């Protein structure tokens, strides 16, 4: 299924994953194309925190869902 | 209360959990939501 990962700035990336894909694997895929380590990938679905050990189907994440890739760095 | 209290909630609902980082970003920007988004995204002032 196709999902949309939209960052805070506005940058949206397309990701190809399956319903059985773990959130952790999702971050690993994002890192490979964006270069952003999972450590800073605080994936939040409109307020719903996505646990790495959970799957996309766990949070009822359907196709064309917009996930928010929040880069939580240590600064500010 | 806080001057950016309602702002934090707006961010939280959009896709934020840590209100601390939100406050820090709002504080650094002087009171701007979109600019604060870049603040956290960059991890401070690049």
Spatial neighbors of B33 by CB under 8 A, at least 6 apart, are B7, B10, B11, B26
Helix (H) or strand (E) holding B21: helix B19-29
Interface touch B15/A76, C-beta < 8 Å: no
DSSP state of B15: H
Phi, psi at residue A3, to the nearest 5°? -125, 160
Domain spanning B1-46, CATH architecture = Orthogonal Bundle (1.10)
Tokens of A65: 């869902």
User: What experiment produced this structure?
Assistant: NMR
Phi, psi at residue B40, to the nearest 5°? -70, -40
CATH number of A1-76: 3.10.20.90
Residue of A nearest to B29 (CA): A76
Q: Closest approach of chain B CAs to the CA of A20, in angstroms?
A: 23
SS3 for A39?
helix
Report how far residue A34's alpha carbon sits from residue A14's, in angstroms, rounded to the nearest whole number. 11
Per the listing, tokens 């490979």 go with: A32
Alpha helical stretches, state H, chain A: 23-34
């Amino acid at each position: 299924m196709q999902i949309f990962v939209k960052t805070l700035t506005g940058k949206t990336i397309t990701l190809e994953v399956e319903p059985s894909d773990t959130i952790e694997n999702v971050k690993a895929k994002i890192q490979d194309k964006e270069g952003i380590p999972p450590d800073q990938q605080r994936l939040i679905f409109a307020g719903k925190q996505l646990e790495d050990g959970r799957t996309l189907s766990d949070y009822n994440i359907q196709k064309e869902s917009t996930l928010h890739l929040v880069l939580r760095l240590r600064g500010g | 209360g806080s001057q950016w209290q309602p702002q934090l909630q707006q961010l939280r609902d959009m896709g934020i959990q840590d209100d601390e980082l939100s406050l820090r970003a709002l504080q650094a920007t002087g009171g701007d939501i979109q600019a604060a988004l870049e603040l956290i995204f960059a991890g401070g002032a690049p």
